[PDB]
């Protein structure tokens, strides 16, 4: 510790100098000849209601039709977005769920919360009633996010500053990703399911490797807690929403700052971040009851999604990109197209 | 409307019915968040209310107690890290926050004051009333009667403090005990009545370990909280 601190400081200085030398021109002047997105107007095509307490998590399905929503009344509801029909109202043992995931195959739904347990529910079962398939209890802190990897592996970030890749069939924790000093708030899987980024309570996001968990990269550009994270569609970049009322677009294999999405009249922190189908639009939900839409390549607001009383706390974009569904703390889901 | 679509809608309505049955139970019960450090007799209070009226790394422990045929669901955190910045936002819709404070020891008294200040002035925790419990008044009685620990050592303002005229004396209590007890209560109330502006209100109590009236006190304070909320709906407050 006598010289380890100094060595770490000088190594960080060297990394910063390398990053500075690696930056020729920022994204501002690179995308200077691109025509603007052009004042996107989006309206509430669907309004989904039936949750009692605040809706705190949601996740779109791969078919872009069914979406799962987890609300703090201990309720897990799968909605058919087209007909606004709710399927599989799943009751939870712990009414403090903070995250929900929908398996890519659509056969399982994950939910976790303050009970330190990730419950995997089997949607398609012979008996016909949804039941808990597997309870994963290895974390010592609240589960903030969870994402299905291959219908048998699940990556869950907890409040004990650790991520964990599990093995649902055996119920044991396969790999543990450590390195965060603050509790991890969100995680996003890469399109190829070989990488994933995690944003925690520190000013840093970490790109890990699911195969061995050796934590390739760390990006430090924010100033407060990072509440949301999501890759670009191509998997070579990701956007982070933090608590300092700013969004930031980092790029893999460059370790750089591409864009900062913020405005002077914005003071509430970001809560959820998602991308459009082509990655041109970045949909960010805020604590001022809005879902400001940004042009990713030009960093200017393109549209605002009103109609929510409390904070949004969750939003997702369909795999085909037809619609965007935003939850809220007023217990109402809004689907926009 | 296809025949398959008819069944899908019919299943949803048979879902809607269950959700309506669940809403009857969710609204009947009042959820209470129980805070407090390790020194406070939080576990003793939990045990007292659990026995009186009706898992290795669990993050939340839930106890439900029914008084006057109304149910209260009280949650205290278990295996959670000391950083409460994030998971405290999950309790924005609780009826009240039971803030138990060990009034005996003073090495961490100011820590409890800072915890109360942080809870009070929180954007997502505003409009939530706190049922402040000043537990273990007996231990404070012996500690202040022996005259071994001086209050002005930790809080210098105790020297220029006198018991308020509105303070109700406890029979058989020495004036020094009452003065110190009400000094602690007023020290908490000073933070309480500084930014609430009628949105939320604090309910101090001089609880002990022997006493069994904690459930009744919580019931009365929750009744007052809901009455104030309903009056605020009419903008009467």
């Amino acid at each position, epitope marked *: 510790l006598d010289q380890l601190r100094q060595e770490a400081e000088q190594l960080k200085n060297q990394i910063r100098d390398a990053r500075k030398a690696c930056a020729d021109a920022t994204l501002s002047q690179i995308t200077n000849n691109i025509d603007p997105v052009g004042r996107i107007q989006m309206r509430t095509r669907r309004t989904l209601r039936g949750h009692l307490a605040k809706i705190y998590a949601m996740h779109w399905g791969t078919d872009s039709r069914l979406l799962v929503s987890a609300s703090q009344d201990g309720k897990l509801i799968i909605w058919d977005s087209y007909t606004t029909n709710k399927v599989h109202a799943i009751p939870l043992r712990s009414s403090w769920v903070m995250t929900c995931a929908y398996a890519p195959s659509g056969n399982y739904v994950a939910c976790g919360g303050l009970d330190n347990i990730c419950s995997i529910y089997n949607l398609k079962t012979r008996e016909g009633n949804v039941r808990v398939s597997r309870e994963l209890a290895g974390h010592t802190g609240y589960l903030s996010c969870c994402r299905f990897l291959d219908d048998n592996q699940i990556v869950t970030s907890s409040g004990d500053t650790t991520c964990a890749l599990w093995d649902i069939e055996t119920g044991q924790q396969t790999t543990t990703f450590t390195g965060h000093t603050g509790d991890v708030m969100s995680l996003s899987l890469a399109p190829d399911t070989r990488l994933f980024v995690s944003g925690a309570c520190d000013a840093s996001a970490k790109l890990w490797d699911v195969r061995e968990g050796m934590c390739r990269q760390t990006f430090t550009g924010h100033e407060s807690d990072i509440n949301a994270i999501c890759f670009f569609p191509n998997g070579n970049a990701f956007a982070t929403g933090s*608590d300092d009322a700013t969004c930031r677009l980092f790029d893999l294999r460059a370790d750089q700052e591409l864009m900062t999405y913020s405005h002077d009249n914005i*003071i509430c922190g970001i809560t959820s971040v998602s991308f459009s189908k082509s990655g041109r639009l970045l949909l960010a939900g805020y604590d001022d009851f809005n879902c400001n839409v940004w042009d990713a390549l030009k960093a200017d607001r393109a549209g605002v999604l009103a109609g929510h009383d409390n904070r949004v706390s969750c939003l997702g974009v369909t795999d085909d990109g037809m619609a965007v569904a935003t939850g809220s703390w007023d217990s109402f889901l809004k689907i926009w197209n | 409307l296809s025949a398959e679509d008819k069944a899908a809608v019919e299943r949803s309505k048979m879902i809607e019915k269950q959700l309506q049955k669940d809403k009857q139970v969710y609204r009947a019960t009042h959820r209470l968040l129980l805070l407090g450090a390790d020194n406070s007799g939080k576990s003793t209070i939990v045990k007292q209310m659990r026995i009186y009226h009706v898992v290795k790394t669990s993050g939340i422990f839930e106890t439900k107690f029914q008084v006057d045929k109304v149910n209260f669901h009280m949650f205290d955190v278990g295996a959670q890290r000391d950083e409460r910045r994030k998971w405290i936002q999950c309790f924005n819709d609780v009826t009240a926050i039971i803030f138990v404070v060990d009034s005996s020891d003073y090495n961490r008294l*100011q820590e409890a004051l800072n915890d109360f200040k942080s809870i009070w002035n929180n954007r997502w925790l505003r409009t939530i009333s706190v049922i402040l419990f000043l537990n273990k008044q007996d231990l404070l009685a012996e500690k202040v009667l022996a005259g071994k620990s001086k209050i002005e050592d930790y809080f210098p303002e105790f020297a220029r403090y006198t018991t308020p005229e509105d303070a109700t004396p406890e029979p058989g209590e020495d004036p020094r005990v009452t003065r110190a007890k009400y000094f602690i209560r007023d020290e908490f109330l000073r933070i309480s009545t500084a*930014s609430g502006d009628g949105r939320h209100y604090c309910y101090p109590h001089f609880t002990c370990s022997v006493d069994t009236e904690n459930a009744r006190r919580i019931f009365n304070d929750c009744r007052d909280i809901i009455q104030r909320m309903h009056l605020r709906q009419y903008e009467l407050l």
Partner: nanobody
Framework: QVQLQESGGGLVQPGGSLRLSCAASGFTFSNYKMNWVRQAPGKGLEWVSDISQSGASISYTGSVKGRFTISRDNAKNTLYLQMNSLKPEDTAVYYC?????????????????????RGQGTQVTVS
């Protein structure tokens, strides 16, 4: 990234004055409520003082009401703590901590262990 560097503080006679400086980098200083905490040997983290944005809400803990003062310079990106008269009891490691979530009134878990937005700290020994 956010980094807080503490300077000053060390061996001092019981009655001297020490100035503790804290240089902040990686964030907009004026938008956060800066703090000052201490950890005595074997006593754990203990809150000492805090100051809101651009001052105007200076507060202290009971033990140092009349001795310690806290100021900040947003232009110089710095937070200062002046200790006019030291006692042998308050020898400790002092940490310049920063509240999270700018533009806020509360300040959560600053005294919690492994706080992210906290400096390395400086040792102050009084004897």
């Amino acid at each position: 990234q956010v980094q807080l560097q503490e300077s000053g503080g060390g061996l001092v006679q019981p009655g001297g004055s020490l100035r503790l400086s804290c240089a902040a980098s990686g964030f907009t200083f004026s938008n956060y409520k800066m703090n000052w905490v201490r950890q005595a040997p074997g006593k754990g983290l203990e809150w000492v003082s805090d100051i809101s944005q651009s001052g105007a809400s200076i507060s202290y803990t009971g033990s140092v009401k009349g001795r310690f003062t806290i100021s900040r310079d947003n232009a110089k990106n710095t937070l200062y703590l002046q200790m006019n008269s030291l006692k042998p009891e308050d020898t400790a490691v002092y940490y310049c901590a920063r509240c999270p979530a700018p533009f806020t009134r509360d300040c959560f878990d600053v005294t919690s262990t492994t706080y992210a937005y906290r400096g390395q700290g400086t040792q102050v020994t009084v004897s």
